[PDB]
Design a protein around this ligand. Structure first.
Ligand SMILES: O=C(O)c1ccc2c(CN3CCOCC3)c[nH]c2c1
Lengths: 99, 6, 99
């Protein structure tokens, strides 16, 4: 897919067997999703943004499918107002910026 | 890390 | 160009005879710099991020070149930890996400 930027690049994801939508964020180093349960153990991490830091739970080697493309990597979970797919998984689906 | 703007 | 995401997509931007750099940020509705060369009277604006909400200074109709693509629009000044080019300016330079 090619995604223009006249609105927020929200796409369908599948994670933990649940369909969700999330924001393709090139300004996000990591992926951060709203509170959900995921398999495996987590470890505490702090993530920076506009408005300050938030405390997140870091699960490694999670499978997620973004518009039908499977990716494995780190997913942070916590009190974000929006689900966000950061560069750590955007590289795994071969997502690039074009102009 | 950083996550970026509503 | 075609920009992969293995590192932050920082680009040369020029504003007010100053070359600065900023992150092509598909997750940002707005363009936000930490500080900008002495550009006039500003208007108050509120924006948000994952950590909460901040006050910013809104400057309209700013001339900016991004990789030597000319664009024009609102540039906010605020406590962002990295300068960011948001969708308001990304659409003007024809930038898309592709995978
Ligand atoms: O899910 C939680 O219950 C939780 C609880 C505490 C933390 C912390 C505390 N740290 C992390 C490493 O750097 C400084 C502070 C982070 N995530 C967290 C998540």
């Amino acid at each position: 897919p090619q995604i223009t930027l006249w609105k927020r690049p929200l796409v369908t994801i599948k994670i933990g067997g649940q369909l969700k939508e999330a924001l393709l964020d090139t300004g996000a180093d990591d992926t951060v999703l709203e509170e959900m349960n995921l398999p495996g153990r987590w470890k505490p991490k702090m993530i920076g943004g506009i408005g300050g830091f938030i405390k997140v739970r870091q699960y490694d080697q999670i499978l997620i499918e973004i518009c039908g493309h499977k990716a494995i990597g780190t997913v942070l979970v916590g009190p974000t107002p929006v689900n966000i797919i950061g560069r750590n998984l955007l590289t795994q689906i071969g997502c690039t910026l074009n102009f | 890390x950083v996550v970026x703007a509503x």
